[PDB]
RNA sequence: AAACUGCGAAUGGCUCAUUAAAUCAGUUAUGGUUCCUUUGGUCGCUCGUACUUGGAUAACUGUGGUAAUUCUAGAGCUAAUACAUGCCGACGGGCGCUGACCCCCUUCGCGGGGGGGAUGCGUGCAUUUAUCAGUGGUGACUCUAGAUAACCUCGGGCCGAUCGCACGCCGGCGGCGACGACCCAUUCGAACGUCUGCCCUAUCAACUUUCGAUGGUAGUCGCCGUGCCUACCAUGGUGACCACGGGUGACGGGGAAUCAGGGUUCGAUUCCGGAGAGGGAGCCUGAGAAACGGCUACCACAUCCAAGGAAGGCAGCAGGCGCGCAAAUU
């Protein structure tokens, strides 16, 4: 799955912008590619279009369906899963616990 | 401009705090509370400037955060808490209680009261209104809302409330012959008997007051605070009994006291 | 933006005014809520002090009142026919206060049927719809019919009100501000007010 | 003497005029209830306000205004506006250097209710302060005193 | 607390209104 | 420690450019508005999974892009005081209703008048369209309170889904707190009303009214009153008692420089009020800003650049340059 990336200048690809190059958006809280410094602050930033072309420095991909072969450093390796649930409902759901 | 101010310049502070000008630029800006900014006494002023229990504001903060100060029976940790007229300050560790009463020079006197008298206070009622299914209400000068008041209590009367329960114990009607105190203006701090009230519709009423020694003065109705029924007070008056002395008699008493005591 | 200050205005003598400050936030104005007729669409605008105003943009339902009978029902708004301020507020059909509207008469008519004990009125063409004549004829005891008769004794509807009830529409006045509260409420026009507004609409047409 | 001379219906908002009547007990226009109040400070409501028919939302007696603040006086100078008149207030201003005064005046545009009829230029009018009624109008005529040089 | 305060005020109001009625009767006696 | 959340950052400090009934001062009003916080503090007043509910996301771990910033993307986890759409609890209710049963006063002829009863309807002052009492107030309300008919917002609406070391009571109860939250109380305010008072100038005598100029009516908008704005209507409104126009090396005041008495000058400057943050303009958040040690543009300057781009605002404290007769320590 194409999950985004950065262009030649490192600018990230915004999800909704349907273009090939770069645009300047007045971003705010709740948008990607922006972290507000103070509450209510909006800043205009340059972001890359979500359409993939050759003028990208990196393109992030997510494996959603495995094949018949394991990549030497991507699938055989088992990065440990840690930090189990904390909310009591999540605890009794994950371990499949009843009311009592 | 742009919202409320949080500072108070030391020279813009109320003059009855008796602050001096060389200590600092700022005065303790009293916090919002039951009493107005210009007619209150911040707890730091009382604890440091009057009682001299503390030398700096930090020591006042230590005293207050040790939960030693009770205003109207409630522990108050705010050092700029506005304490005002008839408010009871009780310090249990040292076992003394004070009532904030104006002295005859318009300033809050250090008036010590017995622990029996520290269980109540007098509150002048500011408005009476009916709300929430025909339930009468009562607003005092202390910003206390007391539900279900006596139907005979009207505006400008003063009630007596027990501090522990916060309920009306007794009340004095506003009428001629009743003792009163002046809480604002030139005659602020004076105690006398109400003799006559002049009503000016659409404007401020004028109440005329006579001292024990027959001195007669007047002030606006909003500045009148009736103390007791008739000429006897329901609270203990300060060292001066509300009599304002002319500067000649003040000087004469000072000279006589200097002569007699060596 | 839009300002409501008075210091941009000429003096009473007619002299020009020189501003001593630039526009303040508390002097602002906002675009009008041209509340048209359509499916309910209300936008919320945050105002001074953190309170909320309900900027209604589309409304087709309102809580109108029949003052003489003291019967207020939720009713559908059909049309606007008179505006005492601007003609274009009728041509473009915007709901503002004190504008004359056409509302349905079905809830008031149905309540009147629940009131109905009157003698023969307008029942010529009939309706022949079953389970509706229960509310007019019914089976009832003696004292219930006595109460209904004593209610009929004081039943009196104006001829103009009848003529409107035949058409299924009623003339009403918007007594609320839809652009500020989000509600288009009011009262049904009756009496000399109804006559006056009928003359106004007739002369306009 | 039509009252409805505007594009909207003119009526006192407080008075409900659509109450159900009785046919056998009604012959001609029975009554239209009149809303009026007595303003404070000892001002008596004029008769023409109580038994009149005019609709004035700025009238101190039959309108929505409340009189509060300054009670002033002046002489009527112009009556060329609808329900509004211009009064002139003359006073003497002290100049301390010369120990003398100078004549000065200010015109106030005040609202005049239709309860005061046949008010003439030169009459002394008592005005009361109210909320801003227009751009320049902040006072309402409360009592009209006929000039000494009148009929 | 609400119930008790309402009851106490009802009793006080009954007393106050009864004394007002008695005072009005005494005034109209003269 | 980090990070999410909350709060503050709208105070303070600086400067006096603009500004001549403007600001400001005394006086008065808000019965024409809003108000974080403090303090009293309606907080079982709703009549048919509650022994605790749900997408998440930071910190953290890892993969990165860009010459560059307090730039940020992708992936793996995990919380709550961004947020409750419960009615096991007052659960018998009470109150007001489109009415299947009931009994009476001289009488077997339609007789005028009384109380219970269910499937079927509803039940709070912040939100607008309603009588007699008109609970309690004001000088004065179209005030407050009450009653009936209804309504109640995609961008919903208040009636609590959480923490605090002692060990204690005849599947249950309990004491102190903390934090929230509608709404009432002017605590701090703010805003808007011009009652009176301001420098020089007529070589400024008439000014305002396609563009609101003065008023009226109805609305829009606004927190509210109001030509504040719109439509229609009426021609008004202000001036030699200086309007209007121009100038000011004009921020206003408290106040400061001689004492005969009277005055003449000054007040950028530590207190109060106002305004501004290079010049304009427009906004987000918020109770409060048209905020600039917030954002977004344009105008004028100006910084880094790998030339793709990115980042600016000392009339804050110090310090530089410049300007100058003229003013201090990074």
PDB file of C-alpha atoms in Angstrom, chain B residues 134-136 147-152 167 171, chain E residues 1-2 5-6 8-9 12-13 15-16 19:
ATOM      1  CA  UNK B 134     -41.137  30.984  44.378  1.00  0.00           C
ATOM      2  CA  UNK B 135     -38.166  30.566  46.725  1.00  0.00           C
ATOM      3  CA  UNK B 136     -37.117  33.926  48.229  1.00  0.00           C
ATOM      4  CA  UNK B 147     -32.297  30.954  50.706  1.00  0.00           C
ATOM      5  CA  UNK B 148     -35.655  31.184  52.501  1.00  0.00           C
ATOM      6  CA  UNK B 149     -35.096  34.442  54.434  1.00  0.00           C
ATOM      7  CA  UNK B 150     -37.600  35.946  56.832  1.00  0.00           C
ATOM      8  CA  UNK B 151     -40.272  37.896  54.889  1.00  0.00           C
ATOM      9  CA  UNK B 152     -39.687  40.912  57.166  1.00  0.00           C
ATOM     10  CA  UNK B 167     -27.944  30.663  58.492  1.00  0.00           C
ATOM     11  CA  UNK B 171     -31.835  40.866  61.882  1.00  0.00           C
TER      12      UNK B 171
ATOM     13  CA  UNK E   1     -31.884  19.812  53.298  1.00  0.00           C
ATOM     14  CA  UNK E   2     -34.192  21.181  50.605  1.00  0.00           C
ATOM     15  CA  UNK E   5     -35.735  24.215  54.633  1.00  0.00           C
ATOM     16  CA  UNK E   6     -39.003  24.271  52.682  1.00  0.00           C
ATOM     17  CA  UNK E   8     -39.289  25.480  58.095  1.00  0.00           C
ATOM     18  CA  UNK E   9     -39.995  28.362  55.730  1.00  0.00           C
ATOM     19  CA  UNK E  12     -42.402  30.738  59.316  1.00  0.00           C
ATOM     20  CA  UNK E  13     -44.541  32.035  56.441  1.00  0.00           C
ATOM     21  CA  UNK E  15     -46.756  32.594  61.306  1.00  0.00           C
ATOM     22  CA  UNK E  16     -45.862  35.786  59.429  1.00  0.00           C
ATOM     23  CA  UNK E  19     -49.658  38.033  62.235  1.00  0.00           C
TER      24      UNK E  19
END
